[PDB]
Amino acid sequence: MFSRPGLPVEYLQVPSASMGRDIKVQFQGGGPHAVYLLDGLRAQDDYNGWDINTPAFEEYYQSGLSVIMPVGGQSSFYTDWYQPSQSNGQNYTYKWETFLTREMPAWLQANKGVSPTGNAAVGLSMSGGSALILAAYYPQQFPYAASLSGFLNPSEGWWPTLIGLAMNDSGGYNANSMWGPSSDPAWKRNDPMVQIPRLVANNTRIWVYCGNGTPSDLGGDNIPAKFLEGLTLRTNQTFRDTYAADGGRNGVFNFPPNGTHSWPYWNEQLVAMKADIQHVLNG
Numbered sequence: 691m692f693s694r695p696g697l698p699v700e701y702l703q704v705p706s707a708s709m710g711r712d713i714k715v716q717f718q719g720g721g722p723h724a725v726y727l728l729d730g731l732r733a734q735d736d737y738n739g740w741d742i743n744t745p746a747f748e749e750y751y752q753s754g755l756s757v758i759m760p761v762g763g764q765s766s767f768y769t770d771w772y773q774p775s776q777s778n779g780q781n782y783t784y785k786w787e788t789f790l791t792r793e794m795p796a797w798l799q800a801n802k803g804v805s806p807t808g809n810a811a812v813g814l815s816m817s818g819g820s821a822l823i824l825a826a827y828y829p830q831q832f833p834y835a836a837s838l839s840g841f842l843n844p845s846e847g848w849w850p851t852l853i854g855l856a857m858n859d860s861g862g863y864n865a866n867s868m869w870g871p872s873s874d875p876a877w878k879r880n881d882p883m884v885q886i887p888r889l890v891a892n893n894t895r896i897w898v899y900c901g902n903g904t905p906s907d908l909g910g911d912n913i914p915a916k917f918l919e920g921l922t923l924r925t926n927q928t929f930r931d932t933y934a935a936d937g938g939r940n941g942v943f944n945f946p947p948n949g950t951h952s953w954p955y956w957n958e959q960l961v962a963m964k965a966d967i968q969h970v971l972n973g
């Protein structure tokens with residue numbers, strides 16, 4: 691838990707015009723290019739889950755890379771929502787794609803000397819697919835994307851239902867407010883599997899971790915663990931196979947037999963990809 695004391699970690703307040711509020715960002719300056727560490731489904735408003743559960747700041751200190759941990763956005767999928775969550779009285783509309791691709795990099799460039807292009811997006815759970823989608827649509831900003839235990843095919847089959855249940859359990863957020871009914875084009879637009887041809891076209895460097903065991907982030911107490919584990923395995927296998935079948939050749943896949951969907955294995959991946967990121971972003 692957390693990193694050693696004494697690191698140059700700043701707690702910034704970054705204005706978001708689109709969301710009508712300041713967004714807290716934990717930041718460690720260390721070079722013009724940065725790793726964006728996105729949080730999981732249960733993202734809190736006090737600290738990013740990477741800081742709470744791992745020594746990420748410590749592990750990337752003097753890496754030649756800046757580290758950016760945005761704080762907040764529980765169940766947001768770091769996306770621009772159609773409207774406020776109608777199930778829990780959310781009093782604004784999540785605009786986290788706008789924040790991550792416009793407002794925050796503009797501010798960090800002007801105030802901290804961080805380049806808006808040539809960065810890495812690293813997500814887990816909910817933000818695993820987010821990281822890939824950001825790379826798909828903003829390749830100049832993110833030539834590198836890592837997805838750790840992400841939702842890789844959110845528009846397909848039972849996934850919109852399962853994601854809806856998880857979002858509801860994580861703070862009462864409503865998936866229909868986010869991307870609409872499952873037939874809405876927003877679901878496929880934000881589906882990494884569907885957007886594989888974009889990742890291939892951009893030659894995005896992707897790093898994909900698949901875990902074993904029950905995805906604790908949610909099944910929903912109705913749903914058998916075996917059912918969810920089976921679906922997760924098949925979806926991941928389909929993603930890897932489809933990436934290759936579509937001409938993808940810039941993807942690192944990690945499926946250790948012992949790996950679980952947990953912070954220790956997600957941190958092990960973050961450490962494992964450090965030299966990879968240093969090479970892609972800094973040469």
Ligand SMILES: *[Se]c1ccccc1C(=O)Nc1ccc(N)cc1
Pocket residue numbers: 898899900923926927930943944945
């Ligand atoms: Se990530 C994954 C999910 C389901 C099945 C297989 C995988 C996978 O990545 N397998 C794999 C095989 C060989 C090498 N060198 C890396 C990864």
